[PDB]
Write a protein that binds this ligand. Structure first.
Ligand SMILES: NC(=O)[C@H]1CCCN(C(=O)Cc2cncnc2Cl)C1
Ligand SMILES: [Zn+2]
Length: 138
């Protein structure tokens, strides 16, 4: 679990969005595993606008933050789950690191701000949904 709170927006993994997120929907994209909903309160976070390929992410299954080197956002094949059929997920960045299903939503940050959130994993890999291209979040 986990979300980004920026301005009057809440960014979550689309597969973990609540009834309230869908009732206050701003934008969603199944191909990216992202959903953005509106909030009444002003958010705590700031978004990176950069091309960093190193950062630190929060791993809830270890209660720890880990440093990572990650690939540029790209189209990556993701196997079927209870939430999606087998498909290509776009704007996804991979890194070597630990992840379990409940780890989705953990923030990845660089020196400039929030880069993205955990969205995939397995076998010593972790995948992050990039949010740096969503300029309208600001
Ligand atoms: N973005 C998706 O399609 C995810 C939907 C939830 C299920 N997905 C996973 O990768 C679950 C997972 C498994 N093992 C280790 N880390 C993780 Cl995060 C895929
Ligand atoms: Zn950066």
């Amino acid at each position: 679990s986990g979300a980004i709170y920026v301005g009057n927006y809440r960014v979550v993994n689309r597969h973990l969005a609540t009834h309230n997120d869908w009732a206050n929907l701003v934008w969603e994209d199944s191909s990216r595993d992202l959903l953005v909903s509106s909030t009444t309160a002003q958010g705590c976070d700031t978004i990176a606008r950069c091309d960093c390929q190193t950062g630190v992410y929060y791993c809830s299954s270890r209660r720890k933050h880990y440093p990572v080197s990650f690939s540029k956002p790209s189209l990556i094949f993701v196997e079927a789950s209870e939430y999606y059929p087998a498909r290509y997920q776009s704007h996804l960045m991979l890194a070597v690191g630990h992840s379990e299903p409940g780890d989705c939503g953990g923030i990845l940050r660089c020196q400039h701000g929030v880069v993205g959130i955990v969205s995939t994993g397995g076998n010593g890999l972790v995948g992050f949904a990039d949010v740096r291209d969503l300029l309208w979040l600001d």
